[PDB]
PDB file of C-alpha atoms and ligand atoms in Angstrom:
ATOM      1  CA  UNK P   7      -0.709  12.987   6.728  1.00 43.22           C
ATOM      2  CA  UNK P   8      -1.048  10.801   9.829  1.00 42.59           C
ATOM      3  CA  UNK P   9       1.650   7.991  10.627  1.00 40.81           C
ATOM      4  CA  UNK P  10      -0.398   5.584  12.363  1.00 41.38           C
ATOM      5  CA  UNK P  11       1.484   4.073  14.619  1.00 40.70           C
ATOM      6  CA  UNK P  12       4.602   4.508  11.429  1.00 39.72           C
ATOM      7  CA  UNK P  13       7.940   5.683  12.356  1.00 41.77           C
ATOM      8  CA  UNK P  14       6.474   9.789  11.181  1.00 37.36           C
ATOM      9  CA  UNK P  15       8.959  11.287   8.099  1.00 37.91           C
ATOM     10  CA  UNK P  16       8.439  14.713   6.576  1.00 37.04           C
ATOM     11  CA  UNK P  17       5.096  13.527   4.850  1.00 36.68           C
ATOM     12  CA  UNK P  18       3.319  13.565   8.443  1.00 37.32           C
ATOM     13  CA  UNK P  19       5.302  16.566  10.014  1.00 43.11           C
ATOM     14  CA  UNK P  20       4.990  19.973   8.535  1.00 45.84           C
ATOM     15  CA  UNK P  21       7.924  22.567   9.377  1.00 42.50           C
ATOM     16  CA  UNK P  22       6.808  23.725  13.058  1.00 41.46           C
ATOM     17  CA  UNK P  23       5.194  20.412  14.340  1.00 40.90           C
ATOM     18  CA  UNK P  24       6.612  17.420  16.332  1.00 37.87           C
ATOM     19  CA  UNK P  25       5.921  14.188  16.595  1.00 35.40           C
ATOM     20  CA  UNK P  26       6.829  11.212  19.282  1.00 36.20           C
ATOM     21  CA  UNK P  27       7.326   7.752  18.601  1.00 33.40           C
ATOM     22  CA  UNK P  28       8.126   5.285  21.883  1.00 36.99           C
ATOM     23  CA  UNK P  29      11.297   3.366  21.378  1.00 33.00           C
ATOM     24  CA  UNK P  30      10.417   1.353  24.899  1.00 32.74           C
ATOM     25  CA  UNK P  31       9.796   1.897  28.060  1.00 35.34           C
ATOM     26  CA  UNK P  32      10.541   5.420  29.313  1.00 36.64           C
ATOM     27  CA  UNK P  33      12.471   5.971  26.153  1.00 37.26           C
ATOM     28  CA  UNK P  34      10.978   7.980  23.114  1.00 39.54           C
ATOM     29  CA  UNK P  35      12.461   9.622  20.210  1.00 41.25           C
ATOM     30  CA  UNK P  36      11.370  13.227  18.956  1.00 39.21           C
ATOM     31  CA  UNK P  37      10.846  13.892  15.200  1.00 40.07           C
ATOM     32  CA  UNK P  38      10.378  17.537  13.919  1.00 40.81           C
ATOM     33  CA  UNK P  39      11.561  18.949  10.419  1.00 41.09           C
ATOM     34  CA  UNK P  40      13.307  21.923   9.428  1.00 38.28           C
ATOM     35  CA  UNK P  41      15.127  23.732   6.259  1.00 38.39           C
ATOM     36  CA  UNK P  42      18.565  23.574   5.109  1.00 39.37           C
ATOM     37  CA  UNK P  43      19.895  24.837   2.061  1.00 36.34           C
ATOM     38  CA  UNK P  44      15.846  25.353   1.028  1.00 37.00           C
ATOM     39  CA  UNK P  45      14.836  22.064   1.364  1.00 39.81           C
ATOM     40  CA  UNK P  46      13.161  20.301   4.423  1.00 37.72           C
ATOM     41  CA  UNK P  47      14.763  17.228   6.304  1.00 40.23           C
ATOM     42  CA  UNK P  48      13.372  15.435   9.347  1.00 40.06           C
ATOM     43  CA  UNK P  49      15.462  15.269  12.311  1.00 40.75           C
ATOM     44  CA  UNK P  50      15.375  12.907  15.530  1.00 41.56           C
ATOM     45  CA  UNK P  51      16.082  13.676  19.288  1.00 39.32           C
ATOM     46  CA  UNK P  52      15.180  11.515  22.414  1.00 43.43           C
ATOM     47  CA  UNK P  53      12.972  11.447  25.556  1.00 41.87           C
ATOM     48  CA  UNK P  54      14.271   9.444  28.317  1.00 40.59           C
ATOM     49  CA  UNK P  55      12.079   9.211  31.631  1.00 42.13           C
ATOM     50  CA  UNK P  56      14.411  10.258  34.700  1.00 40.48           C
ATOM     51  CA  UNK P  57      12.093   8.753  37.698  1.00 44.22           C
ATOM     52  CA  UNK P  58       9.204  11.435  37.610  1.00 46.78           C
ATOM     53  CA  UNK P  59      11.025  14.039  35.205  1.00 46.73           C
ATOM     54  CA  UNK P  60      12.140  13.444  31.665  1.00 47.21           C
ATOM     55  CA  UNK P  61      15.987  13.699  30.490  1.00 48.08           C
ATOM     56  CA  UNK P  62      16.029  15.345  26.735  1.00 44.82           C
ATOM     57  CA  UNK P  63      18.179  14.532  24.646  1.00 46.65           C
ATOM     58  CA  UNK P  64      18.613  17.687  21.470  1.00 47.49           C
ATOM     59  CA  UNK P  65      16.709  20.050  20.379  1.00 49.07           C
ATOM     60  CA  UNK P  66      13.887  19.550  18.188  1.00 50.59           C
ATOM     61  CA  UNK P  67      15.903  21.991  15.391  1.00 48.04           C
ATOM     62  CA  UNK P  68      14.616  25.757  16.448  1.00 49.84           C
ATOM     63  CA  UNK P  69      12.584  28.038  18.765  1.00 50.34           C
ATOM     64  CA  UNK P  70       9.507  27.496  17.285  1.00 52.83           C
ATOM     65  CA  UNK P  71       9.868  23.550  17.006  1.00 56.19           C
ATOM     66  CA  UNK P  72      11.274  23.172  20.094  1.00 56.40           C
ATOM     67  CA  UNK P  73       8.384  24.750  22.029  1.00 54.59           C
ATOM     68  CA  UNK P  74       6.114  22.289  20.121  1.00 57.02           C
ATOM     69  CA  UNK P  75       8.387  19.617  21.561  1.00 56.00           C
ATOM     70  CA  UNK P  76       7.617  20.767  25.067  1.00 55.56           C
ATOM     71  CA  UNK P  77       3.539  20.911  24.354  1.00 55.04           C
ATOM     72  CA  UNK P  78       3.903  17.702  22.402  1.00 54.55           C
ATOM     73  CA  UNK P  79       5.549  16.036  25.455  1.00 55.55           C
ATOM     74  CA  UNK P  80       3.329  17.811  28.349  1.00 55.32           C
ATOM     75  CA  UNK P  81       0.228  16.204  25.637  1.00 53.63           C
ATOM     76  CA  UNK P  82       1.538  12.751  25.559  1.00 52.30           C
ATOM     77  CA  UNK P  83       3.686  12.057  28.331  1.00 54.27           C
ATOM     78  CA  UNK P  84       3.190  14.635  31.222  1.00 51.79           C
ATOM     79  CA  UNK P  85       6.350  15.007  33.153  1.00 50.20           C
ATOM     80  CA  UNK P  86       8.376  17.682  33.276  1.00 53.09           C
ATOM     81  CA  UNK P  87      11.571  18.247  31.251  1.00 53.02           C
ATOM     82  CA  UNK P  88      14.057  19.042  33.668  1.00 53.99           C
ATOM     83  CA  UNK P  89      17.784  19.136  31.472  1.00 50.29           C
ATOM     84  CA  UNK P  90      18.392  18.526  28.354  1.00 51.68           C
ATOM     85  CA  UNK P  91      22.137  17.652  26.701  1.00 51.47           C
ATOM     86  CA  UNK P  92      22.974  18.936  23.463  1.00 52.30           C
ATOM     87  CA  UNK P  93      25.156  16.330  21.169  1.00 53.25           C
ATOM     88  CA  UNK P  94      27.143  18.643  18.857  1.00 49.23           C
ATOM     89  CA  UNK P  95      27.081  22.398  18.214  1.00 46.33           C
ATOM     90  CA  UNK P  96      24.785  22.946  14.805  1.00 44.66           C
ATOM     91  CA  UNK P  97      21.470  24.452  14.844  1.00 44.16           C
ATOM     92  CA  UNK P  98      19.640  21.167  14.626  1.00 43.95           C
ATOM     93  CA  UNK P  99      21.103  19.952  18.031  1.00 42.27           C
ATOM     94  CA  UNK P 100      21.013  23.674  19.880  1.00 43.51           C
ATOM     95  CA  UNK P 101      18.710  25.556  18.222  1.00 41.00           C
ATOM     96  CA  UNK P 102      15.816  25.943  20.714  1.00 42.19           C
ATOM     97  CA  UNK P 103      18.368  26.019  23.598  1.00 39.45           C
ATOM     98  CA  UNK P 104      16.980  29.419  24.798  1.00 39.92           C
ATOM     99  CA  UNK P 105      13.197  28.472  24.596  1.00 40.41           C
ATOM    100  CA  UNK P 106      14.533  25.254  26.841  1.00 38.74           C
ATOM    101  CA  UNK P 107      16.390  27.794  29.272  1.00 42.27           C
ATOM    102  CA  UNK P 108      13.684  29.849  29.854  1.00 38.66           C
ATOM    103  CA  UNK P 109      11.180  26.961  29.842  1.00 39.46           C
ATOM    104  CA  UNK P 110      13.624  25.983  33.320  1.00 41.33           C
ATOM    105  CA  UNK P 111      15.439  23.222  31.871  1.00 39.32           C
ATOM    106  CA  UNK P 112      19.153  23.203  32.653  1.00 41.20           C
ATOM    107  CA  UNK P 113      20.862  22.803  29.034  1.00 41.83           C
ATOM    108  CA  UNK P 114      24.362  20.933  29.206  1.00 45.57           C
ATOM    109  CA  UNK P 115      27.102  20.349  26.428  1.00 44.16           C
ATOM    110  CA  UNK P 116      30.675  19.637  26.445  1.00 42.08           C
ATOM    111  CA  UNK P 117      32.871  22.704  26.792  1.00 40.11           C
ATOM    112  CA  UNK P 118      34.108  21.632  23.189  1.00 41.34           C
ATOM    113  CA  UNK P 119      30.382  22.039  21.860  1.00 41.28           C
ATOM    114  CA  UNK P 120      29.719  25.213  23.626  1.00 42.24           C
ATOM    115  CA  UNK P 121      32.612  26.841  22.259  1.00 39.34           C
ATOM    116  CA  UNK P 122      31.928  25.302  18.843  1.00 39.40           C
ATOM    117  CA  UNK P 123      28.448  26.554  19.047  1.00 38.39           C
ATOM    118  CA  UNK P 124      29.541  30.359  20.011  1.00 41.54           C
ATOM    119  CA  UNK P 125      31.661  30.667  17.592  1.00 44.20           C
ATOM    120  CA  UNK P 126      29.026  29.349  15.094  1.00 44.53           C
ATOM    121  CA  UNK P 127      27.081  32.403  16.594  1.00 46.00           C
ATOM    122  CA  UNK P 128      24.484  29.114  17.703  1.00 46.21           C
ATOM    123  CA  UNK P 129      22.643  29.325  20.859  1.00 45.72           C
ATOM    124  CA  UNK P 130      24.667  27.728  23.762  1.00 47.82           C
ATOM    125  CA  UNK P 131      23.692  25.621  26.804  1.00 45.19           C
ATOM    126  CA  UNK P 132      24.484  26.842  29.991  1.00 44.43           C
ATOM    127  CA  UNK P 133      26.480  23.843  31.665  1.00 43.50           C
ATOM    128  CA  UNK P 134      29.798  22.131  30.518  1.00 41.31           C
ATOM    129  CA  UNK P 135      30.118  18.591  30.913  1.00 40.23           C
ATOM    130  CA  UNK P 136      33.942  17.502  31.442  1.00 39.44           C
ATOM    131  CA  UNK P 137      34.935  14.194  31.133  1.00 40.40           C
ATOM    132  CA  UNK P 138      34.180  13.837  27.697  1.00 36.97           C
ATOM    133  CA  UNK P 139      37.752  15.421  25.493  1.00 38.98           C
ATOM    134  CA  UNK P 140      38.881  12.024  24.705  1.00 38.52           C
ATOM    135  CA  UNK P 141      37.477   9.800  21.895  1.00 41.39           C
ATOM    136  CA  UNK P 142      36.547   6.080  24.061  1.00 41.90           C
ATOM    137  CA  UNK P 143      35.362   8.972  27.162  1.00 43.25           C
ATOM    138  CA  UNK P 144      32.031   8.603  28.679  1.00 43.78           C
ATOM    139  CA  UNK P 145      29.976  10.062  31.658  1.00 42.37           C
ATOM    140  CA  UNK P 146      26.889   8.440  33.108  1.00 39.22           C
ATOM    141  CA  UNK P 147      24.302  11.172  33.426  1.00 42.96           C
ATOM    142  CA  UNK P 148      20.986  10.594  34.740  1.00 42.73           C
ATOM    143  CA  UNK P 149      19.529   7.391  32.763  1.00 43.16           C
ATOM    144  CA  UNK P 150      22.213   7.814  30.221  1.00 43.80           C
ATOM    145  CA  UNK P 151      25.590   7.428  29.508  1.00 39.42           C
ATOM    146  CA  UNK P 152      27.519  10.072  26.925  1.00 42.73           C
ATOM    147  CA  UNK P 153      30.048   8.269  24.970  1.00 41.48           C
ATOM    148  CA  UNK P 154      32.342  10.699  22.785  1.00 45.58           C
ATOM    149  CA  UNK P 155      33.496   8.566  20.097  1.00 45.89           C
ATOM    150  CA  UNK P 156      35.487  10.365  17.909  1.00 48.77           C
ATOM    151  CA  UNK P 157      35.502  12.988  14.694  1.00 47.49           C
ATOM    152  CA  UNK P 158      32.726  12.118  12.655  1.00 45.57           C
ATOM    153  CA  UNK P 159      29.916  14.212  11.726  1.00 45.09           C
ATOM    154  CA  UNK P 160      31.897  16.691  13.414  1.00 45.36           C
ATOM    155  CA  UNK P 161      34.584  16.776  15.934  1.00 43.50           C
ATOM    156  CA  UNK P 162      32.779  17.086  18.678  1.00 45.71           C
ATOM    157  CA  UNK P 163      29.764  14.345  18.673  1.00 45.28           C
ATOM    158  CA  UNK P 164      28.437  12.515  21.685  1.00 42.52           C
ATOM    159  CA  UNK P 165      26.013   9.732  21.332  1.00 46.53           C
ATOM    160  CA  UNK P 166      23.491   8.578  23.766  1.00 46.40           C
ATOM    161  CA  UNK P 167      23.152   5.041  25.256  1.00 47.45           C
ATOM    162  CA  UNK P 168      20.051   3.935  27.769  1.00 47.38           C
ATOM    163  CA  UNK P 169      21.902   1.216  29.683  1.00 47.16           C
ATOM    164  CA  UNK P 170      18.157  -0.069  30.632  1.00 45.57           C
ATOM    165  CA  UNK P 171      16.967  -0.516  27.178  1.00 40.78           C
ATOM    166  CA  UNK P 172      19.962  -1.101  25.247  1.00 41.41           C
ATOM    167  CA  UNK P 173      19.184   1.659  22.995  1.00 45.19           C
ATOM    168  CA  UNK P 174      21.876   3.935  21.292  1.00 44.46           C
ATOM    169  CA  UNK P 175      21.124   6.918  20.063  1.00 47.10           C
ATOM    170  CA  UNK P 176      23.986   7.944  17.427  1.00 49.40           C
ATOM    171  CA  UNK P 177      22.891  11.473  16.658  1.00 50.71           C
ATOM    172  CA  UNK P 178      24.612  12.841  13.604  1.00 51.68           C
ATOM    173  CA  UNK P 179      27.581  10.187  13.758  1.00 50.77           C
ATOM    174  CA  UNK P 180      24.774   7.550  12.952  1.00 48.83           C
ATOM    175  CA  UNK P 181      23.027   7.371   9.638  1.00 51.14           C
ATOM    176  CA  UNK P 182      20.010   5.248   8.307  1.00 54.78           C
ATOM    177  CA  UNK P 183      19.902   2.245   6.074  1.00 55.46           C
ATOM    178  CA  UNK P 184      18.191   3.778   3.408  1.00 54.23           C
ATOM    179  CA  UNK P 185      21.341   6.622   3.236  1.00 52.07           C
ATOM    180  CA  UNK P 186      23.518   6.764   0.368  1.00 54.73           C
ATOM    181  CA  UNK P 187      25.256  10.025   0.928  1.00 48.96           C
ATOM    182  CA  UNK P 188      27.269  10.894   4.548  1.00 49.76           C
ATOM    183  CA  UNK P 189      25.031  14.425   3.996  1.00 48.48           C
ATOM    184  CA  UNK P 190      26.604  18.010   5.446  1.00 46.27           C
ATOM    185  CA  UNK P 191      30.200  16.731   5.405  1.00 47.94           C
ATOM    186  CA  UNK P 192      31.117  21.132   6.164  1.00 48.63           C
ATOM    187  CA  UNK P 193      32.588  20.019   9.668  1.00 44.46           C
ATOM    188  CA  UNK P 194      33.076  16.274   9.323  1.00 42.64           C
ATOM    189  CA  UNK P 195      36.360  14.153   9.718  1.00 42.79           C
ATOM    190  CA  UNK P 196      35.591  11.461   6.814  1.00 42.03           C
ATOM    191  CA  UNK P 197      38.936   9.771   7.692  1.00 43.90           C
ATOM    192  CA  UNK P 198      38.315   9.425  11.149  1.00 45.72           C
ATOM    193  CA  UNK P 199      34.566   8.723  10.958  1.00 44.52           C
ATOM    194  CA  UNK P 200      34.807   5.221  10.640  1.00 45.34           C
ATOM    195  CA  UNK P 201      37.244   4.385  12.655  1.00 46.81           C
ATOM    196  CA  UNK P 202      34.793   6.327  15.471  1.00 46.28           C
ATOM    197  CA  UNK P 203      32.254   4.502  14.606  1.00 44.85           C
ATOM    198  CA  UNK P 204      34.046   1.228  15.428  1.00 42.34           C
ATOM    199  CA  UNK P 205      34.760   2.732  18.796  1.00 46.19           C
ATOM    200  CA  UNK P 206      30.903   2.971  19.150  1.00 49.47           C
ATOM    201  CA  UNK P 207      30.274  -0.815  18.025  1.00 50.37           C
ATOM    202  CA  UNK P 208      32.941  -1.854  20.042  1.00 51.50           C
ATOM    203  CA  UNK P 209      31.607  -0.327  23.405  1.00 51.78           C
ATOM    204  CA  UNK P 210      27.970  -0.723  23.063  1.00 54.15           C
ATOM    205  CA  UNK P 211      28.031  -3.890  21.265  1.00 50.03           C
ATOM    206  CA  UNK P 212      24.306  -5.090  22.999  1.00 52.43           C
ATOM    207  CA  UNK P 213      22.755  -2.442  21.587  1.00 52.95           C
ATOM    208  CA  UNK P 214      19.172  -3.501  20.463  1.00 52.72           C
ATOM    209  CA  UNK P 215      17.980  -0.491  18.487  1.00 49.51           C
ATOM    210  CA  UNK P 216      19.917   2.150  16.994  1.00 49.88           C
ATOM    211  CA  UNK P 217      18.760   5.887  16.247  1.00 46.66           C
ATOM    212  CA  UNK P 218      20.147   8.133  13.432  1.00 42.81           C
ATOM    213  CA  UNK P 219      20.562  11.930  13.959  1.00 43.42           C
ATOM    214  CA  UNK P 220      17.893  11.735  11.020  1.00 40.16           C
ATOM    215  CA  UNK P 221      15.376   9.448   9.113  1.00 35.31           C
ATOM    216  CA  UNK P 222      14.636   5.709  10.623  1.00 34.87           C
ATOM    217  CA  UNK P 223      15.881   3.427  13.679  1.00 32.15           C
ATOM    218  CA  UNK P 224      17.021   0.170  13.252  1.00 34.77           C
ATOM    219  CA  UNK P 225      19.245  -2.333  14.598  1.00 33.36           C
ATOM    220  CA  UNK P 226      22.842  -2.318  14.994  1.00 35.46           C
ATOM    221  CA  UNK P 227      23.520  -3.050  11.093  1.00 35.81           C
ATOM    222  CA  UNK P 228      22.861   1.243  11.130  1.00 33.72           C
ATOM    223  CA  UNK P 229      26.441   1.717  12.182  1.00 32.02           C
ATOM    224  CA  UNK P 230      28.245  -0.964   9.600  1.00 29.39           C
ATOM    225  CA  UNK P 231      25.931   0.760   7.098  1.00 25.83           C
ATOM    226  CA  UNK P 232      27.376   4.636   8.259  1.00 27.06           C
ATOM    227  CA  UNK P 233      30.756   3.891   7.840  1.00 28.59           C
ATOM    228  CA  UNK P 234      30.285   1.929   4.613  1.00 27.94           C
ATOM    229  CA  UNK P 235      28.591   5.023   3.739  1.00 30.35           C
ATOM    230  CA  UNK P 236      31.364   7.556   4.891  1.00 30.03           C
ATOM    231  CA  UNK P 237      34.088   5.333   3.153  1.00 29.36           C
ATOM    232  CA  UNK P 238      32.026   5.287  -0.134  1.00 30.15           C
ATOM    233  CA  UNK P 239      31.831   9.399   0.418  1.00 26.84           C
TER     234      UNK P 239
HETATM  235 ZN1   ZN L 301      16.609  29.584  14.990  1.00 24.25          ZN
HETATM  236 ZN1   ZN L 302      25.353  18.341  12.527  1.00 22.18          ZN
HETATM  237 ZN1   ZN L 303      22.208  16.689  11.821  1.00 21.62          ZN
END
Protein backbone atom coordinates (compact mmCIF):
# COMPACT_ATOMS: atom_id res chain seq x y z
CA UNK A 1 0.00 0.00 0.00
CA UNK A 2 0.83 3.71 -0.20
CA UNK A 3 1.53 5.81 3.11
CA UNK A 4 0.38 9.06 2.08
CA UNK A 5 2.22 11.34 3.62
CA UNK A 6 2.04 8.34 6.95
CA UNK A 7 5.11 7.53 8.77
CA UNK A 8 5.48 4.03 5.94
CA UNK A 9 5.54 0.46 8.21
CA UNK A 10 5.88 -2.95 6.59
CA UNK A 11 2.27 -2.66 5.03
CA UNK A 12 3.70 0.02 2.42
CA UNK A 13 7.32 -1.44 2.03
CA UNK A 14 7.80 -4.84 0.58
CA UNK A 15 11.26 -6.67 1.39
CA UNK A 16 13.66 -4.85 -1.27
CA UNK A 17 12.01 -1.32 -1.35
CA UNK A 18 12.70 1.93 0.63
CA UNK A 19 10.93 4.56 1.58
CA UNK A 20 11.80 8.35 2.91
CA UNK A 21 9.95 10.31 5.24
CA UNK A 22 11.41 14.15 6.04
CA UNK A 23 11.93 14.65 9.72
CA UNK A 24 12.82 18.61 8.86
CA UNK A 25 14.86 20.44 7.07
CA UNK A 26 17.82 18.59 5.53
CA UNK A 27 17.05 15.75 7.84
CA UNK A 28 15.15 12.53 6.62
CA UNK A 29 14.83 9.14 7.95
CA UNK A 30 15.11 5.88 5.69
CA UNK A 31 12.62 2.99 6.15
CA UNK A 32 13.26 -0.42 4.39
CA UNK A 33 12.26 -3.99 5.78
CA UNK A 34 14.02 -7.11 6.04
CA UNK A 35 13.79 -10.85 7.65
CA UNK A 36 14.88 -12.11 10.87
CA UNK A 37 14.19 -15.29 12.31
CA UNK A 38 11.47 -15.64 9.12
CA UNK A 39 9.54 -12.86 9.81
CA UNK A 40 9.80 -9.25 8.34
CA UNK A 41 10.47 -6.05 10.54
CA UNK A 42 10.86 -2.48 9.32
CA UNK A 43 13.95 -0.75 10.14
CA UNK A 44 14.92 3.13 10.19
CA UNK A 45 18.21 4.96 9.17
CA UNK A 46 18.75 8.77 8.50
CA UNK A 47 19.58 11.30 5.74
CA UNK A 48 21.19 14.37 6.88
CA UNK A 49 22.07 17.13 4.16
CA UNK A 50 25.95 18.02 4.53
CA UNK A 51 25.93 21.51 2.43
CA UNK A 52 25.54 20.02 -1.19
CA UNK A 53 26.21 16.21 -0.23
CA UNK A 54 24.17 14.08 2.11
CA UNK A 55 25.67 12.44 5.47
CA UNK A 56 23.98 8.73 5.90
CA UNK A 57 23.39 7.55 8.71
CA UNK A 58 23.03 3.07 8.53
CA UNK A 59 22.37 0.97 6.18
CA UNK A 60 19.07 0.36 4.86
CA UNK A 61 19.51 -3.63 6.18
CA UNK A 62 21.31 -5.42 2.95
CA UNK A 63 22.83 -5.17 -0.57
CA UNK A 64 19.84 -5.23 -2.31
CA UNK A 65 17.95 -2.62 0.02
CA UNK A 66 20.63 -0.53 0.34
CA UNK A 67 21.06 0.12 -3.39
CA UNK A 68 17.32 1.03 -3.40
CA UNK A 69 18.27 3.52 -0.71
CA UNK A 70 20.74 5.17 -3.03
CA UNK A 71 18.04 5.30 -6.16
CA UNK A 72 15.38 6.25 -3.66
CA UNK A 73 17.55 9.21 -2.49
CA UNK A 74 19.10 10.25 -6.10
CA UNK A 75 14.76 10.14 -6.93
CA UNK A 76 13.78 12.36 -4.15
CA UNK A 77 16.51 14.34 -2.96
CA UNK A 78 19.41 14.49 -5.57
CA UNK A 79 22.67 14.96 -3.82
CA UNK A 80 25.18 12.75 -3.54
CA UNK A 81 25.90 10.43 -0.59
CA UNK A 82 29.30 11.04 0.25
CA UNK A 83 29.97 8.85 3.92
CA UNK A 84 27.93 7.10 5.72
CA UNK A 85 28.51 5.98 9.71
CA UNK A 86 27.43 2.74 10.80
CA UNK A 87 25.86 2.71 14.59
CA UNK A 88 26.54 -0.86 15.80
CA UNK A 89 27.89 -3.99 14.10
CA UNK A 90 24.58 -6.26 13.08
CA UNK A 91 23.47 -6.75 9.65
CA UNK A 92 20.70 -4.20 9.86
CA UNK A 93 23.22 -1.30 10.54
CA UNK A 94 26.21 -2.74 8.03
CA UNK A 95 24.71 -4.81 5.78
CA UNK A 96 24.94 -2.92 2.45
CA UNK A 97 28.35 -1.49 3.54
CA UNK A 98 30.01 -2.91 0.36
CA UNK A 99 27.29 -1.70 -2.17
CA UNK A 100 27.99 1.90 -0.23
CA UNK A 101 31.90 1.36 -0.76
CA UNK A 102 31.76 0.74 -4.15
CA UNK A 103 28.94 3.25 -4.75
CA UNK A 104 32.18 5.86 -3.41
CA UNK A 105 30.89 6.57 -0.12
CA UNK A 106 33.50 6.46 2.64
CA UNK A 107 31.84 4.03 5.39
CA UNK A 108 33.02 4.89 9.08
CA UNK A 109 32.42 2.98 12.48
CA UNK A 110 34.10 2.88 15.71
CA UNK A 111 37.05 0.51 15.86
CA UNK A 112 34.81 -1.34 18.55
CA UNK A 113 32.02 -1.87 15.77
CA UNK A 114 34.37 -2.87 13.10
CA UNK A 115 35.86 -5.47 15.08
CA UNK A 116 32.45 -6.52 16.38
CA UNK A 117 31.23 -6.68 12.89
CA UNK A 118 34.33 -8.98 11.58
CA UNK A 119 34.05 -11.19 13.93
CA UNK A 120 30.25 -11.44 13.25
CA UNK A 121 31.64 -12.31 9.69
CA UNK A 122 29.33 -8.74 8.86
CA UNK A 123 30.51 -6.46 6.25
CA UNK A 124 32.83 -3.72 7.73
CA UNK A 125 33.30 0.01 7.00
CA UNK A 126 36.47 1.12 6.01
CA UNK A 127 37.27 4.06 8.56
CA UNK A 128 37.54 3.95 12.46
CA UNK A 129 36.28 6.72 14.34
CA UNK A 130 38.26 7.19 17.79
CA UNK A 131 37.01 9.20 20.32
CA UNK A 132 34.11 7.30 21.00
CA UNK A 133 35.41 4.06 23.82
CA UNK A 134 33.87 5.79 26.66
CA UNK A 135 30.12 5.77 27.53
CA UNK A 136 29.25 10.07 27.91
CA UNK A 137 32.06 10.25 24.53
CA UNK A 138 31.03 12.12 21.53
CA UNK A 139 32.57 13.41 18.19
CA UNK A 140 31.02 16.09 16.02
CA UNK A 141 31.10 14.78 12.48
CA UNK A 142 29.84 16.65 9.67
CA UNK A 143 26.14 17.90 10.71
CA UNK A 144 26.15 15.43 13.49
CA UNK A 145 27.39 14.64 16.64
CA UNK A 146 28.02 10.67 17.72
CA UNK A 147 27.26 10.23 21.29
CA UNK A 148 28.26 6.61 22.65
CA UNK A 149 26.08 6.15 25.50
CA UNK A 150 26.60 3.04 26.93
CA UNK A 151 25.72 -1.01 26.68
CA UNK A 152 22.37 -1.25 25.53
CA UNK A 153 21.18 -2.90 22.52
CA UNK A 154 24.63 -3.91 22.36
CA UNK A 155 27.87 -2.76 23.67
CA UNK A 156 28.84 -0.83 21.18
CA UNK A 157 25.82 1.67 20.09
CA UNK A 158 26.21 5.24 18.95
CA UNK A 159 23.26 7.44 18.48
CA UNK A 160 22.91 10.34 16.23
CA UNK A 161 22.01 13.96 17.22
CA UNK A 162 21.42 16.98 14.44
CA UNK A 163 22.43 19.90 16.66
CA UNK A 164 20.34 22.12 13.97
CA UNK A 165 17.14 20.34 14.34
CA UNK A 166 17.24 18.95 17.67
CA UNK A 167 16.63 15.59 16.41
CA UNK A 168 18.10 12.33 18.01
CA UNK A 169 18.30 9.48 16.33
CA UNK A 170 18.64 6.48 18.98
CA UNK A 171 19.21 3.61 16.61
CA UNK A 172 18.79 0.28 18.31
CA UNK A 173 19.28 1.78 21.97
CA UNK A 174 15.89 3.64 21.26
CA UNK A 175 12.60 1.86 21.01
CA UNK A 176 8.98 3.03 20.05
CA UNK A 177 5.97 3.73 22.16
CA UNK A 178 3.96 1.14 20.88
CA UNK A 179 6.99 -1.58 22.08
CA UNK A 180 6.36 -3.98 24.69
CA UNK A 181 9.29 -6.27 24.31
CA UNK A 182 13.27 -4.83 24.34
CA UNK A 183 13.35 -7.36 20.97
CA UNK A 184 16.94 -9.26 20.00
CA UNK A 185 18.32 -8.99 23.55
CA UNK A 186 21.47 -11.83 21.88
CA UNK A 187 24.11 -8.94 22.48
CA UNK A 188 22.34 -6.55 24.84
CA UNK A 189 23.43 -5.32 28.41
CA UNK A 190 19.75 -5.18 30.05
CA UNK A 191 21.41 -3.95 33.30
CA UNK A 192 23.21 -1.29 31.86
CA UNK A 193 20.63 -0.25 29.24
CA UNK A 194 18.86 2.03 31.26
CA UNK A 195 21.18 3.55 32.99
CA UNK A 196 22.63 4.46 29.14
CA UNK A 197 19.73 5.64 28.27
CA UNK A 198 19.71 8.25 31.07
CA UNK A 199 23.10 9.28 29.82
CA UNK A 200 21.28 10.02 26.47
CA UNK A 201 18.34 12.12 28.19
CA UNK A 202 20.69 13.75 30.21
CA UNK A 203 22.94 15.13 27.29
CA UNK A 204 20.47 15.82 24.66
CA UNK A 205 17.77 16.90 26.85
CA UNK A 206 16.25 19.58 23.87
CA UNK A 207 15.71 16.99 21.77
CA UNK A 208 12.43 17.63 19.76
CA UNK A 209 11.89 14.34 17.95
CA UNK A 210 13.26 11.09 18.69
CA UNK A 211 13.91 8.09 16.16
CA UNK A 212 13.89 4.35 17.08
CA UNK A 213 16.31 1.88 15.37
CA UNK A 214 12.74 0.52 14.26
CA UNK A 215 8.94 1.34 13.97
CA UNK A 216 7.73 5.19 14.73
CA UNK A 217 9.38 8.66 15.87
CA UNK A 218 8.16 10.53 18.54
CA UNK A 219 9.10 12.85 21.13
CA UNK A 220 11.40 12.48 23.91
CA UNK A 221 8.81 10.28 26.07
CA UNK A 222 10.54 7.32 23.41
CA UNK A 223 13.49 7.05 25.73
CA UNK A 224 11.48 6.95 29.34
CA UNK A 225 9.33 4.44 27.43
CA UNK A 226 12.80 2.16 26.31
CA UNK A 227 14.06 1.83 29.55
CA UNK A 228 10.68 1.17 31.17
CA UNK A 229 10.64 -1.35 28.56
CA UNK A 230 14.20 -2.90 29.18
CA UNK A 231 13.49 -2.93 33.04
CA UNK A 232 10.10 -4.73 32.46
CA UNK A 233 12.35 -7.30 30.09
ZN1 LIG B 1 23.31 -9.51 3.14
ZN1 LIG C 1 21.15 -4.55 16.54
ZN1 LIG D 1 18.10 -3.28 15.04
Amino acid sequence: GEPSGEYPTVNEIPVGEVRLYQIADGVWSHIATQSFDGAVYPSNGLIVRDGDELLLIDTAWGAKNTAALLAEIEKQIGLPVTRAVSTHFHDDRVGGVDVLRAAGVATYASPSTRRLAEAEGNEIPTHSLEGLSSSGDAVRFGPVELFYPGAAHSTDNLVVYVPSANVLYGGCAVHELSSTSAGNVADADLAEWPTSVERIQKHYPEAEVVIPGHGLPGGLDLLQHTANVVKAH
